[PDB]
Amino acid sequence: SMLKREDWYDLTRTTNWTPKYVTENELFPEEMSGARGISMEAWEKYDEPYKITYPEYVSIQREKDSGAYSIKAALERDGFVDRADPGWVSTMQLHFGAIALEEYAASTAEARMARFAKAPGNRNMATFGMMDENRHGQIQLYFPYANVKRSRKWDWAHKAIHTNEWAAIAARSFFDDMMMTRDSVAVSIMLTFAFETGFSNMQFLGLAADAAEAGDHTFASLISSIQTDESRHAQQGGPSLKILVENGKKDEAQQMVDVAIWRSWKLFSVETGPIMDYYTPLESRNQSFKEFMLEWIVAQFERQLLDLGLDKPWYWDQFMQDLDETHHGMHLGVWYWRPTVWWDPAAGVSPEEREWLEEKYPGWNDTWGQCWDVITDNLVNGKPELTVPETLPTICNMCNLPIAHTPGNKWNVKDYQLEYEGRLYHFGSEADRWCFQIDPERYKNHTNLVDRFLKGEIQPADLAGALMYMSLEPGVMGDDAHDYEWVKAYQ
């Protein structure tokens, strides 16, 4: 006979002791634990709501890989990827490059909590968390590797985060901030709660649906499998927030959440936004990126925050408005500067696409449309060179993303500048600037790509220089995904 889990579970996480040959602070250094003056005993209240034990883990996850990997081997020799919509191929090439190594990096973050959390529950869950991201990183390398002979862009699944291409900088800027350079409690809040529970879970759901809809079942299976691992470790932040709120730190807890969500949203608005509203074919589109944000992301956050005794962040209304705008900026930025990324951006401004854009976002043609008008005439009128850039946009010093917003008839592009210790910083929103102001020691001597350019760190100090600096050469440098085929619609 076997015990029922409930009967012996607690003993798995009954592992705290009172050190004696070294001191608590030496065993649990504050910079790594973030115990915040709250006692060991009070951290022992930490109670993960989703429980699992080693034998369950290896059994359940053995089956998950069996599936995922059999699906891939079964579908490999049909090579779906050779005949997929190219906005789809692009979606995939972007995903792998932006995520694979960061997923792997996430295991270190988990390892952070696994050693340094004073909550024994957290330490164990994070060990499983640590295994989870070992998987994600691993599988999200194994999968793209099937395509390395089709194009060098697939090498970026590995290489991207080893480069200074601007998107990779933006990714690392997010991740190192959220999960690599903070204490254990912090990571539990900023990564597992704010980012994984708040964004990347629901994103992965949508991404799997879209993969399916596109006829890519290898990828649909991949993504959906990974997604089933999420809540197991994504849960870790909640209990931490409970302890913090119940013990005199509601504000500190608030501040981390405020920072973690804004930073998540910015990165989300360049990675998911453009894909939803521009790369996925018109007839494959269930809802707008704004619709998806409001349904599956925003309400949940409010629900979570309310149940935890926290408030909506100060910037929440701004964030609402920004759903009409930010990602359209991000997409225009990416498309216009398309030689600077490692996938082919899809324009997504055909007439039919444009009425859809106009429906989901009333005022779009009156604003975003204007820029695209000029892009379009230029392409009709055999002047394609005015659709590629001769300079570098202003980079936000927080999110490391272009500073961009409404154009056209409702022009509202702003820079939330800040002078600090005789250096001028640039910020793409009030919130990005605020993130620096609450903790400047943390960002102060970081330099964005533009700073580097300006300081003589990029040599030759021209565009071709910036291209080598960013490890990009023809063949990975991105161009229009449908090879301009949407232009024929205007002649």
């Binding site: 359209h328 900026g329 225009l332 930025g333 216009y336 975003w368 204007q370 820029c371 008008d373 000029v374 892009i375 230029n378 005015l386 659709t387 850039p389 001769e390 300079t391 570098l392 946009p393 202003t394 272009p402 500073i403 961009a404 917003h405 409404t406 154009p407 056209g408 008839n409 022009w411 592009v413 702003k414 820079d415 500048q417 002078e419 001028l424 640039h426 533009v450 350019f453 300006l454």
Partner: protein
């Protein structure tokens, strides 16, 4: 040779524009336009391009030169359409 950040009217994005300390506002405006007009913004030849400091709204005369503007390197500048 002086870096500024161009926030061109009706464009979507602020851009890095090298200008010259010797340039007039007019000539700043021209160097900016190059990267916005006919790329993402429609010309307006019944109009005149003016230069204002983005942070505080201060409008520079067409004729003043960069040297005299009180600009911080990398300062953001609004490039707007006017009749005067």
């Amino acid at each position: 040779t002086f870096p500024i950040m161009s926030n061109f009217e009706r464009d979507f994005v602020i851009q890095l524009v090298p200008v010259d300390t010797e340039d007039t506002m007019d000539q700043v405006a021209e160097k900016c336009a190059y990267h916005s007009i006919n790329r993402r913004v429609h010309p307006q030849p019944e109009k005149i391009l003016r230069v204002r400091r983005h942070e505080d709204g201060t409008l520079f005369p067409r004729g003043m030169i960069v040297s005299d503007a009180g600009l911080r390197p990398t300062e953001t500048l609004d490039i707007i359409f006017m009749d005067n």
